[PDB]
Scaffold this motif. Sequence first.
Motif, PDB file in Angstrom:
ATOM      1  N   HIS A 105       0.854  -1.178   0.000  1.00  0.00           N
ATOM      2  CA  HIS A 105       0.000   0.000   0.000  1.00  0.00           C
ATOM      3  C   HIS A 105       0.894   1.233   0.000  1.00  0.00           C
ATOM      4  CE1 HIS A 105      -4.230   1.166   0.466  1.00  0.00           C
ATOM      5  NE2 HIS A 105      -3.796   2.229   1.121  1.00  0.00           N
ATOM      6  N   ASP A 114       2.440   4.763   1.207  1.00  0.00           N
ATOM      7  CA  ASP A 114       2.815   5.221   2.551  1.00  0.00           C
ATOM      8  C   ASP A 114       3.326   4.103   3.465  1.00  0.00           C
ATOM      9  OD1 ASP A 114       0.978   7.750   1.745  1.00  0.00           O
ATOM     10  OD2 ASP A 114       2.323   8.329   3.380  1.00  0.00           O
ATOM     11  N   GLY A 141       6.045   2.497   3.078  1.00  0.00           N
ATOM     12  CA  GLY A 141       7.498   2.497   3.113  1.00  0.00           C
ATOM     13  C   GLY A 141       8.217   1.809   1.967  1.00  0.00           C
ATOM     14  N   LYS A 142       7.552   1.679   0.823  1.00  0.00           N
ATOM     15  CA  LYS A 142       8.170   1.076  -0.357  1.00  0.00           C
ATOM     16  C   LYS A 142       9.418   1.844  -0.785  1.00  0.00           C
ATOM     17  CE  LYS A 142       4.528   1.367  -3.097  1.00  0.00           C
ATOM     18  NZ  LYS A 142       3.459   1.993  -2.273  1.00  0.00           N
ATOM     19  N   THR A 143       9.232   3.135  -1.048  1.00  0.00           N
ATOM     20  CA  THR A 143      10.300   4.009  -1.525  1.00  0.00           C
ATOM     21  C   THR A 143      11.500   4.028  -0.582  1.00  0.00           C
ATOM     22  OG1 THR A 143       8.856   5.499  -2.798  1.00  0.00           O
ATOM     23  CG2 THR A 143      10.949   6.395  -2.010  1.00  0.00           C
ATOM     24  N   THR A 144      11.231   4.229   0.705  1.00  0.00           N
ATOM     25  CA  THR A 144      12.286   4.312   1.708  1.00  0.00           C
ATOM     26  C   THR A 144      13.091   3.018   1.777  1.00  0.00           C
ATOM     27  OG1 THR A 144      10.804   5.731   3.003  1.00  0.00           O
ATOM     28  CG2 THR A 144      12.831   4.974   4.067  1.00  0.00           C
ATOM     29  N   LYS A 204       8.194   0.315   9.409  1.00  0.00           N
ATOM     30  CA  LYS A 204       7.941   1.310  10.452  1.00  0.00           C
ATOM     31  C   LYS A 204       7.797   0.667  11.822  1.00  0.00           C
ATOM     32  CE  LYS A 204       5.457   4.392   7.265  1.00  0.00           C
ATOM     33  NZ  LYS A 204       4.228   5.215   7.092  1.00  0.00           N
ATOM     34  N   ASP A 229       9.811   0.999  14.202  1.00  0.00           N
ATOM     35  CA  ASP A 229      10.233   1.984  15.190  1.00  0.00           C
ATOM     36  C   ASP A 229       9.053   2.834  15.639  1.00  0.00           C
ATOM     37  OD1 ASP A 229       9.971   3.322  12.705  1.00  0.00           O
ATOM     38  OD2 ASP A 229      11.260   4.948  13.423  1.00  0.00           O
ATOM     39  N   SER A 280      12.702  -1.508  10.425  1.00  0.00           N
ATOM     40  CA  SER A 280      12.564  -0.064  10.317  1.00  0.00           C
ATOM     41  C   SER A 280      13.664   0.453   9.401  1.00  0.00           C
ATOM     42  CB  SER A 280      12.664   0.594  11.691  1.00  0.00           C
ATOM     43  OG  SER A 280      12.626   2.007  11.577  1.00  0.00           O
ATOM     44  N   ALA A 281      13.274   0.963   8.237  1.00  0.00           N
ATOM     45  CA  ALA A 281      14.239   1.449   7.256  1.00  0.00           C
ATOM     46  C   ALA A 281      14.943   2.703   7.759  1.00  0.00           C
ATOM     47  CB  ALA A 281      13.556   1.717   5.924  1.00  0.00           C
ATOM     48  N   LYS A 282      14.217   3.509   8.526  1.00  0.00           N
ATOM     49  CA  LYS A 282      14.776   4.707   9.136  1.00  0.00           C
ATOM     50  C   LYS A 282      15.798   4.334  10.204  1.00  0.00           C
ATOM     51  CE  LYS A 282      13.560   8.249  12.505  1.00  0.00           C
ATOM     52  NZ  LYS A 282      12.504   8.695  13.455  1.00  0.00           N
TER      53      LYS A 282
HETATM   54  N1  LIG Z   1       9.563   5.755  11.266  1.00  0.00           N
HETATM   55  C1  LIG Z   1       9.655   5.218  10.025  1.00  0.00           C
HETATM   56  N2  LIG Z   1       9.083   5.880   8.985  1.00  0.00           N
HETATM   57  C2  LIG Z   1       9.145   5.386   7.726  1.00  0.00           C
HETATM   58  C3  LIG Z   1       9.847   4.115   7.499  1.00  0.00           C
HETATM   59  N3  LIG Z   1       9.760   3.860   6.179  1.00  0.00           N
HETATM   60  C4  LIG Z   1       9.061   4.879   5.612  1.00  0.00           C
HETATM   61  N4  LIG Z   1       8.701   5.790   6.536  1.00  0.00           N
HETATM   62  C5  LIG Z   1       7.926   7.032   6.295  1.00  0.00           C
HETATM   63  O1  LIG Z   1       6.735   6.761   5.555  1.00  0.00           O
HETATM   64  C6  LIG Z   1       6.435   7.862   4.696  1.00  0.00           C
HETATM   65  C7  LIG Z   1       6.051   7.346   3.318  1.00  0.00           C
HETATM   66  O2  LIG Z   1       6.795   6.166   3.026  1.00  0.00           O
HETATM   67  P1  LIG Z   1       7.256   5.867   1.514  1.00  0.00           P
HETATM   68  O3  LIG Z   1       8.725   5.520   1.481  1.00  0.00           O
HETATM   69  O4  LIG Z   1       6.975   7.051   0.621  1.00  0.00           O
HETATM   70  O5  LIG Z   1       6.386   4.576   1.105  1.00  0.00           O
HETATM   71  P2  LIG Z   1       5.658   4.467  -0.326  1.00  0.00           P
HETATM   72  O6  LIG Z   1       4.916   5.744  -0.640  1.00  0.00           O
HETATM   73  O7  LIG Z   1       4.676   3.320  -0.284  1.00  0.00           O
HETATM   74  O8  LIG Z   1       6.693   4.185  -1.388  1.00  0.00           O
HETATM   75  C8  LIG Z   1       7.681   8.728   4.618  1.00  0.00           C
HETATM   76  O9  LIG Z   1       7.410  10.011   5.186  1.00  0.00           O
HETATM   77  C9  LIG Z   1       8.722   8.017   5.454  1.00  0.00           C
HETATM   78  O10 LIG Z   1       9.426   8.952   6.276  1.00  0.00           O
HETATM   79  C10 LIG Z   1      10.444   3.453   8.682  1.00  0.00           C
HETATM   80  O11 LIG Z   1      11.057   2.368   8.575  1.00  0.00           O
HETATM   81  N5  LIG Z   1      10.309   4.051   9.874  1.00  0.00           N
END
Ligand SMILES: Nc1nc2c(ncn2[C@@H]2O[C@H](COP(=O)(O)OP(=O)(O)O)[C@@H](O)[C@H]2O)c(=O)[nH]1
Length: 448
Positions: free
Chosen positions: A14, A16, A18-21, A100, A102, A135-137
């Motif tokens: 879905h 948001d 965390g795919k991109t991160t 996520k 964390d 947690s990618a962060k």
């Molecule tokens: N705390 C935390 N936030 C995350 C993590 N991965 C992604 N996020 C947050 O989730 C938000 C959107 O994630 P994103 O990478 O855009 O996922 P995508 O839109 O599905 O590709 C961003 O503001 C990131 O900061 C994680 O491992 N830990």
Amino acid sequence: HMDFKNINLGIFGHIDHGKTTLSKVLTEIGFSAFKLENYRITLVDAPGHADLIRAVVSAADIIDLALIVVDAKEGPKTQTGEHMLILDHFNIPIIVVITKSDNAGTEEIKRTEMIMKSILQSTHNLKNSSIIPISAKTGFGVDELKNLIITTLNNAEIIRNTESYFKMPLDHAFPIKGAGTVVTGTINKGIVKVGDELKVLPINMSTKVRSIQYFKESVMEAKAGDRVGMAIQGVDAKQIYRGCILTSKDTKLQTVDKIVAKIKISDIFKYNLTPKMKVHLNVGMLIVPAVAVPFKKVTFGKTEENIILNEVISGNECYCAFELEEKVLAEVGDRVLITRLDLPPTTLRICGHGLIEEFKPIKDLNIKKEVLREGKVKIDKGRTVIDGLAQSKVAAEKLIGEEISIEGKDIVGKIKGTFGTKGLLTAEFSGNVENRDKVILNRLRRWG
Ligand SMILES: Nc1nc2c(ncn2[C@@H]2O[C@H](COP(=O)(O)OP(=O)(O)O)[C@@H](O)[C@H]2O)c(=O)[nH]1
Ligand SMILES: [Mg+2]
């Protein structure tokens, strides 16, 4: 040095979630790739929902492993579901990554973990797939994720098809001048060498290969499974769009209108068999509106008949005759994905999947309807009557001279007469007929 293996890793979930991160975290150790042991891992990449769909439908052959991300806190959402489905149909090994961590407590993570387990158990080929919280962060569990990717790639059988004709889809196209074009894509089948004559479809032109870019490098030869940039001559990039396919001249690829498929159903209860149905058919990289007529193949002891589905899904045969509104590029044996994408993103959109058996129109399939009419045997003194096969004297008269059987008694009869104004009949039977007997009327009809 050491021989590398070329891997394509998809990332799904879905938005948001965390795919991109996750992708960025993985790429630091277009074209975005990273190495694990001797594996060269190129990320299969599309921005989101329908793009990942179009990506898997076309690239399923070469996608070795997929990561399905799910937020720890809010768990599985709709897109997670459809991605899971699609990956299950095309038999692509997956790792469930809980993102996520964390931002969530232990209890929450374990919850989502278990929900994902329960979900995985509802799928055919994904039945048990490893799940890691990360947690990618933070970097939490990321190392373990890499080790798991390695293990999975070690187990999975990766078959690159060199032996067949060169077949590659075109993701992007860049003109340089009127005399040249660069296209980018992952090779499905075959082999290419610099200075080869290929063709672009559906437009059917003939072009030559100037340059092959692989892994930010120039090479003389590329193989199936490799994601390559290619400079080709004889085409401007304005003619080449989302659905175009670069392939060799021995190609089995065809531009198709009517498609006959062998269809497996995702969820039985959500599936309906009402014929002549309007859906969105995913073929290669395109999605074409389509009309579907479900049918089964029955052997009557002499001739094979294709009969409209009896609505029984018992037995796995759901040959579907598809008539497409637009054209499409296809080959026999290509995995096809039936979707209803008209529906809101909030509900599961997959209306099936299946292998293309034939390109044939419905009219030539000689479609037929199985016809069964049921009535009882009423016997008064000295007279035998059959009731329920006809509702009026007209229909009753239409029925005269047909074949009729009696249920469970193993007794055959022919219907000669027509009795009364209410549609009662009279029939010639082998003896030993009894009152309230069951009459089955059996015949083949022209369907639609
Ligand atoms: N705390 C935390 N936030 C995350 C993590 N991965 C992604 N996020 C947050 O989730 C938000 C959107 O994630 P994103 O990478 O855009 O996922 P995508 O839109 O599905 O590709 C961003 O503001 C990131 O900061 C994680 O491992 N830990
Ligand atoms: Mg993203």
